[PDB]
Design a protein around this ligand. Structure first.
Ligand SMILES: O=C1C[C@@H]2OCC=C3CN4CC[C@]56c7ccccc7N1[C@H]5[C@H]2[C@H]3C[C@H]46
Ligand SMILES: O=C1C[C@@H]2OCC=C3CN4CC[C@]56c7ccccc7N1[C@H]5[C@H]2[C@H]3C[C@H]46
Ligand SMILES: O=C1C[C@@H]2OCC=C3CN4CC[C@]56c7ccccc7N1[C@H]5[C@H]2[C@H]3C[C@H]46
Ligand SMILES: O=C1C[C@@H]2OCC=C3CN4CC[C@]56c7ccccc7N1[C@H]5[C@H]2[C@H]3C[C@H]46
Ligand SMILES: O=C1C[C@@H]2OCC=C3CN4CC[C@]56c7ccccc7N1[C@H]5[C@H]2[C@H]3C[C@H]46
Lengths: 337, 337, 337, 337, 337
């Protein structure tokens, strides 16, 4: 019974057009649409994108196609009969690629309300492209934009607008592997201005903060500690080279293999990033040990001895102070601010 | 003969609706469904998901469409004629993507029993998304949820419920590469509460225990052993630096390259994980050797000698005791408890 | 001419059923099927599977559909008209996923013989899942099962059986990258017993022997050689530490970086595997050098000297003998036996 | 109303041919086409290609099919009715593979203007193959060609030509991970000459400059610094070997592990590339230290001492001067020029 | 006009069979086919295959379907009407998988000449499987076979044969990343002999020479140089161990980390390959240094001194001579010959 009464409305009986939008040659069609996101994942420095599947929930009413006569409330049509009725034409502007889910039954759901309101929900997996600045890598804060624009309909034809309450809803417990998702989700309108006209889009923004913990423990601390070891090598006797020169050289080598391993494990990028800066500077002080101490060892070979001891006290004071001033600038620079 | 008698029931002859569920404007439809899983694989820290193909076995009876007249028992229809009859609309809630198998013949099998019972079995490969906490990596225990929910039908429309005997059945000898599958499989109901209503889902839970063996042998033991070597470096003569300072520096370098290699082979994660904690702490004691011994070497340059020997005995007692207390806390912390 | 005479047989003219098998309500249908495999590849520890494309050759005769009237011998129908005639419903039980080849023309070939014999050959690429035990990795022998089962037809309905001569035929010169394929191919029947009944399957088994050569040369020999170097470090003077202690420490460090590199290049597995055992044990003796020699160095600081020399001779005898007994157990354990 | 009036024009009513182009047996059809590119990504040394999705905007007018009678301006037909009208047949010549986006609604948009002008815009993701010469890797400048050619229509049949204003338009803020996109985009005609005839193509060229920063900091500076350390090892006493020979040997080892790590992180290529040249040469000087110093150490064992000191001064002058001349040649060679 | 006149020929009007080949019950059909290859890429040791897209150009004439009446020369039919006419059934024998390009318009082009000649060109991307012997890796020469065979038609039914002039044509400037393509392309017939009969195939062969440059510079030279360093360690004083034993031990360690890094970067193979042989042998001499020098150091502890000096001169002469004889055998062995 509801099938045939549906066939009268959406079929060649009477009349209707899948081609023609509601209110043709009239006021512009509103689509109030809200999304419920199932998952984030695979956020890669490489392809410069993340992958997400959402439940896209669109609502719009056409004056046409509303019975008000028939006993049942709302209505439901089969995913195959989905073509018969006009749907708002929507793409995401920034995805590389997307797909429906056909698993088991088809995931396209549609309901036509008594009053003529239409609820159209589809489940879509899609890969969106987000621009990423790793300029500060460990202290990094990434912003993720998901923007939904109409395709081939100007402001005059239709408008996209968010739901008042719970427009974009994150399914809880996503626990993304490399990032934490900031609870605050900032959504706002966007407008496309082209030669052909003005087109709607709605832009959603998710703030993803990179958690630096693993990098703090695996990368920073060992290197810093090695630097302390070189500082202790500055304390070494004003006579013996091979254990002292040794301390410095060992310091250099350990620093180098550390930087090598970290350079293997980090994301591949050709622009200078924060962690790389830090590794490099640490390596620089590690060298500076053997620089000042080779200066001491060469000047050693009365006045020269006093200059060597003054260079020794000067080293002892300067290394921790310089590295402290440097830390003070660095951390405050990249973290917040 | 069974084809045409099938065409009477499922065809436009008499009447039937693929659109309309059984018992429309009536009592809610039960689907008793049980799954037989063929394989687990590719459980990745990266995409935060695993891949599995199952035989999904659904059973429900419609009062309509039951002959009882025809000589043959049950019936079978071709996978192409599958559309004619109503099927319960089901997705998995947590998969990123899924597909049917069309290989050789189509894998959708359907039988319509004499009494009007319907057995619908399909073979589906699908990638399900499981949240993973590697917070304790080596001692890790992962939980895997597979949840089957109806799409577009409220509690009033239909109910999903497990089989009484052997609801979820693991095909034996899966032997997952990185994990062991706990024989206990815990399944239970779940209920979706949304603005539109209450929807059914059935939730299956597989416990996967990570086996820590390879990490115990390749990562822990060498590092620990190196620590013992530094302990032996504490025994070294109270005079000679370069072999002793040498022992310490070598200890540091070996520790660092070990941590580097392990940092390459482990799964990539930006939050601090157990194995990383352990590596780091070991590296810390490795340093502490050269710290205490540089304290000794500097204080060495009557009372100072006694303080050096007391620092030597204190080192000999403290290092094994501190590392023992630490192990005692650590292992009990992450393993079970 | 053969097209229309084909249309009489397989068409609505006269009668036939794609739905209904041959000999319905009668004796069970034999399908004699043999496969010719084109390629093996991508055998991964990771996904626990290999990829193979085969020519699947099925033969069965239906009493129906046999002309015997028409002049031409056999017959051929277009891949699109393939649906008209009944085909035996077959899946592979263990694949994750599979596909036809549509490249250029369609690869489904079918011939209907004069006597009523049917030859149906299709080209299929598919990814089969094989359980792998790397418990012994270098000396490893893998077994690969390809099993073909009927889908939705009990023993009463049909039977699968191999060809008498050349049932499974390997296309020569496959030269798999990491494995060698044992010429002996062992195929045998298998029977599925389920609540619904008994179903046929034919199981093919390929023995793949892993060739250990690259691991013998790149991993074992250097490590073993390093162990010999430590043995030579046992010969070192009973006086001087830094070159001797040095020899030992260097031995340890080289061993560690070797184990690290090998730990990067090997397949990722969380259960203890043979090569890992071996690496670890070697590292253990490498340590044992510095253990016994630190015992000597500490006991050195009349009777103590004699105990040191006795520990020296004891070391010289024990290390090669212990490592020899160990090799004797190990190699015989994992290789064959 | 516009649907049926569209059906008169593009339908069997009156006449039209999807098969037959405009102006058949007449003047050649112009297609003015401009592209707006959404994203670049995944530019891999490996597959020798990049991935891009564009909005392809084609414009051509057919004398046929232009109403001029009907009140509405332009027109729009559904993506399914797209086949009815003739479209210019276009491939990209260099892609490995490509696809449409079907997500939500179909992304093919078409408008038929009153005058008979046709605007056809489609959204296409496609993977284009660009030849890459890494002969100079760090200082590298890559050129990316996107070429659009007609398929099966000679110069006599149709012509492709760019838009006058804003033919190829980059969507701002692409921020490709490993490269920077030069704002200058050079597009020009190309002509295919084959045995069958002459075919049109339009060729677009994007200049991508590789930014060498990360390689300057992570690879060059540490190595160079190590070289300086060996220079300082030339200053070492004319007597003592083990700290000096030590300095050299340590220099060699650090250099080697640096080259190893960099050899892991760089793109895999079997032809000699710039960064590799540089690493190798640095390693060569690092050796040259121990070469000249072993010459000194051997000649040391009156005149021989003077030759050793002269070799010492000669080393001190030559190493920085040779390495400076080398840098002067190298950097100017690969960067610009 | 040409559309309908095409419909007479290829349509049910008059008669024609897509099923039935030209000259049925007659002389065998020739297809002269030549390919123009667009790209090579992704040649992987792993999957044992390469990926290529070609323009496949087939030509054959059917006596049927030739008008000779109609004014226009040749003809063109739409890719959708491609089914109406018979096409030669062709697969590539060795591909794992393949696909058409549907991007923008369909890439299948067909022309039916006045005389009844048929030109059928299609653009196909496909992944072909080539057997690879890395037995000699750096000096490697790979051969790539592309073989095109008819599917389901015996020698009696049809024949495949190359074009006389320019049968296989490489699009210039392919510049494959790891290989160079030898300009000489050797194509020849191949014949399939099976139980069912004899089938045609045409086999094309591309010679790909691996360029060893990057391996010569990054792998060989550093190792060899290290060996020279050990040779220089043979010159070291007949008294002092720790710098000399040191030189040897350092030599060993650097060699080991070099072999480790190279073992990470090379393609993964379980059979012994040339570069591995070389690395191993070099490591062997590196050891042999400490072997002979430990022999000297132990025999040192009148006649014994003379034996030590004779072992010293013997070492100095033997190492370069043995390594030279070895190089002489090795390089000539793997390169050419
Ligand atoms: O003519 C154009 C080209 C232009 O390309 C950049 C991206 C676009 C996305 N939407 C949908 C198609 C478009 C549009 C709508 C109606 C007529 C012509 C037309 N377009 C594209 C246009 C923009 C904006 C708009
Ligand atoms: O209006 C909605 C949106 C909402 O999105 C979050 C996830 C959902 C999954 N199932 C199937 C679709 C839905 C539903 C059923 C019937 C009418 C409307 C409707 N939906 C979604 C809804 C939930 C729950 C339910
Ligand atoms: O009811 C079932 C479920 C069960 O699932 C595990 C795997 C199976 C594979 N084949 C094809 C489908 C099945 C079968 C045939 C006819 C009626 C019911 C039915 N099945 C599955 C069954 C097994 C065995 C058999
Ligand atoms: O006969 C051919 C083969 C040749 O192959 C190399 C690449 C080609 C791409 N376009 C489209 C097909 C082609 C063409 C057009 C009309 C008749 C025959 C024909 N072709 C190919 C040709 C070229 C150029 C042109
Ligand atoms: O009966 C067979 C099996 C056999 O399998 C190995 C590979 C083959 C490829 N081509 C196309 C199909 C085949 C063929 C043609 C006509 C009748 C039967 C038939 N086949 C396969 C055959 C070979 C050779 C040939």
């Amino acid at each position: 019974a509801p099938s045939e009464f549906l066939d009268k409305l959406m079929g060649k009986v009477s009349g209707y057009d899948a081609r023609i939008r509601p209110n043709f040659k009239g006021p512009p069609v509103n689509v109030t649409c809200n999304i419920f996101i199932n998952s984030f994942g695979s956020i890669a420095e490489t392809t410069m994108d993340y992958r997400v599947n959402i439940f896209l929930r669109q609502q719009w009413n056409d004056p046409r196609l509303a019975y008000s006569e028939y006993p049942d409330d709302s209505l439901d049509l089969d995913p195959s009969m989905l073509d018969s009725i006009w749907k708002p034409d929507l793409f995401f502007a920034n995805e590389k690629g997307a797909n429906f889910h056909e698993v088991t039954t088809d995931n396209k759901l549609l309901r036509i309300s008594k009053n003529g309101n239409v609820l159209y929900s589809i489940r879509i997996t899609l890969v969106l492209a987000c621009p990423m600045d790793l300029k500060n890598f460990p202290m990094d804060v990434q912003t993720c934009i998901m923007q939904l624009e109409s395709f081939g309909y100007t402001m005059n034809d239709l408008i996209f607008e968010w739901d008042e309450k719970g427009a974009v809803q994150v399914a809880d417990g996503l626990t993304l592997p490399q990032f934490i998702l900031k609870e605050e989700k900032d959504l706002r309108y966007c407008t496309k201005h082209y030669n052909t006209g003005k087109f709607t889009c709605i832009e959603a923004r998710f703030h993803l903060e990179r958690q630096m913990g693993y990098y703090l423990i695996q990368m920073y601390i060992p290197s810093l500690l090695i630097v302390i070891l070189s500082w202790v090598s500055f304390w070494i006797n004003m006579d013996a080279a091979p254990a002292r020169v040794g301390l410095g050289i060992t310091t250099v080598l350990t620093m180098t293999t550390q930087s090598s391993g970290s350079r293997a494990s980090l994301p591949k990028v050709s622009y200078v990033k924060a962690i790389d800066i830090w590794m490099a500077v640490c390596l620089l002080f590690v060298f500076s040990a053997l620089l000042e101490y080779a200066a001491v060892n060469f000047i050693a070979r009365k006045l020269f001895i006093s200059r060597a001891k003054r260079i020794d006290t000067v080293s002892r004071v300067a290394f921790p102070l310089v590295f402290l001033i440097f830390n003070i600038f660095y951390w405050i620079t990249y973290k917040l601010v």
